């Protein structure tokens, strides 16, 4: 729909959003039912009870992994001597097409503060860190002002409304590398080290930041938790009849008539969003491709537009939902240049730890540059498909490389003819010495 009514029953996140795109401060937040779930958690809810409610509410990961946060919180050790636990908010994105947390932190900072309060009491953590980016400046200013207002209002400090639970919140603005978004590399970057990820299964819930149990959660997860604790769990299961419970900040981007961001329940197909919420595309565009998640997932054709944007529904289509922020590709854009730019971003924004990504993403960049410039050679398409087969999950140290080569998978699978037309000259790897007969095999 062009005009959308944001009642709190169906839009638990953005029903208190302002029309003039102004930040909602503490008084306006408390006027529109603010810190009620936090009050319930910090007065009459046990931390294990909150963990069980989050686990049985069906909330999953919103950073693209899709892993349920209740089972994430159930990996904390049961020893009470490990009371130096930490909570981290992955406010960092640097992902092309991901822009929901910018809105969530520019005009809803107290929702994030309440979410960290609830999750820190649930996880028995005493320190919380919002890992932001240097690109987000107004969001950082609004978050710091919200933290100051919450501290002035007797919250976010020592003995929060007479509980004895001590919690302190800080904002860490990173300098910016895309690998810092992953949880283990976010932990490494938080410790003042280079943002190289860490091996598994030493988990962050057992040994994370400075050897202490930590939990890293997305902005939207911590924005969905206080609505769960303020409105109930059966209400959270009774807003969408799908296996993925809750609402997601969806929206299309890229040469669209209305490229925006709207909160919608799971199970909503991309076609209705594109035609009514996005309003269709501009004049003279035929919608030749789309991507469900921003730049990390893989392309889908027009035949997959009828699929509901869930995790499992796009999982069996040879794809994944990711951040659920869709991106549209038209016929006026060659996918050779587009996938070249994607691989360039992934090659220059990866880390230098493990070999296959390190020395295959620049190789894919150079092969796609040769295909763009018309200098493609026999032995490039099969090289790319062998590269993307060898850059899957488990082969590399982290998951940057499967998300890097998934657009290569979809561009190779669907739009093969453009890459085939990108090859003009024959194979030439060696030049003559004019004193040695070459070993020309036939």
């Amino acid at each position: 729909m062009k005009n959308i009514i944001r009642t709190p029953e169906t839009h638990p996140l953005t029903w208190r959003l302002r029309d003039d795109k102004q930040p909602v401060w503490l008084d306006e937040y408390r006027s529109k039912n603010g810190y009620e779930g936090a009050r319930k958690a910090l007065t009459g809810l046990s931390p294990d009870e909150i963990v069980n409610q989050v686990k049985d509410a069906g909330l999953k990961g919103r950073g693209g992994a899709g892993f349920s946060t209740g089972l994430k919180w159930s990996l904390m050790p049961k020893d009470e001597s490990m009371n130096i636990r930490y909570l981290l908010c992955n406010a960092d994105e640097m992902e092309p097409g991901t822009y929901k947390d910018r809105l969530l932190m520019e005009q809803l900072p107290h929702l994030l503060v309440e979410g960290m309060l609830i999750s820190a009491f649930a996880l028995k953590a005493y320190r919380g860190y919002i890992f932001l980016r240097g690109e987000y400046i107004e969001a950082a200013v609004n978050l710091r002002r919200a933290i100051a207002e919450a501290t002035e209002a007797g919250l976010l400090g020592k003995n929060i409304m007479g509980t004895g639970f001590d919690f302190e919140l800080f904002v860490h603005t990173g300098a910016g590398r895309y690998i810092c978004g992953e949880e283990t590399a976010l932990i490494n970057s938080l410790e003042g080290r280079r943002a190289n990820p860490r091996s598994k299964p030493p988990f962050p819930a057992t040994s994370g930041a400075w050897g202490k149990p930590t939990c890293v959660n997305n902005v939207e997860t911590l924005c969905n938790v206080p609505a769960i604790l303020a409105n109930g769990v059966e209400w959270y299961q009774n807003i969408s009849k799908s296996k993925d419970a809750g609402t997601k900040l969806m929206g299309f981007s890229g040469r669209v008539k209305n490229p925006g961001l709207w909160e919608l329940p799971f199970g909503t197909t991309a076609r209705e969003i594109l035609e009514d919420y996005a309003g269709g595309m501009r004049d003279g565009l035929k919608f030749k491709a789309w991507q469900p998640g921003g730049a990390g997932t893989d392309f889908l054709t027009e035949a997959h537009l009828d699929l509901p944007m869930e995790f499992e529904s796009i999982g069996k289509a040879g794809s994944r939902l990711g951040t659920a922020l869709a991106m549209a590709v038209d016929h006026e854009i060659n996918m050779v240049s587009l996938v070249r730019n994607l691989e360039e971003f992934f090659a220059r924004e990866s880390c230098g730890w493990c070999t296959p990504c390190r020395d295959g993403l620049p190789w894919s960049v150079k092969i796609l540059r040769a295909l763009e410039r018309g200098e493609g050679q026999p032995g490039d398409i099969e090289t790319l498909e062998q590269l993307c087969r060898f850059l899957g999950p488990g082969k590399t140290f982290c998951a940057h490389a499967p998300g890097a080569v998934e657009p290569l998978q979809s561009a190779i699978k669907y739009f093969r003819e453009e890459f085939e037309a990108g090859i003009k000259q024959p194979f030439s790897n060696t030049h003559l010495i004019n004193g040695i007969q070459p070993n020309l095999l036939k």
Partner: protein, 72 residues
């Protein structure tokens, strides 16, 4: 030879009066031009620093991008 330095000329008119003078030293082997392979040079393919050849000046070698450079 990976540099095509040691080579076999078609010259065979050899023979010495002493066995001690059949050992050819450096000055008895190095000739004043390229032999059976006229237009090959190894050091245009090597990667080490050479007089008249800085880093990245070899064949199929890019210029050394600085670590401290502003490029992401």
């Amino acid at each position: 030879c990976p540099t095509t330095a040691i080579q076999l000329t078609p010259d065979f008119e050899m023979g010495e009066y002493k066995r001690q003078d059949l050992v050819y030293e450096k000055e008895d082997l190095l000739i004043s031009g390229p032999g059976k392979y006229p237009e090959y040079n190894f050091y245009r393919m090597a990667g080490m620093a050479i007089d008249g050849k800085d880093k990245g000046e070899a064949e199929n070698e890019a210029k050394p991008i600085d670590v401290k450079s502003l490029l992401p």
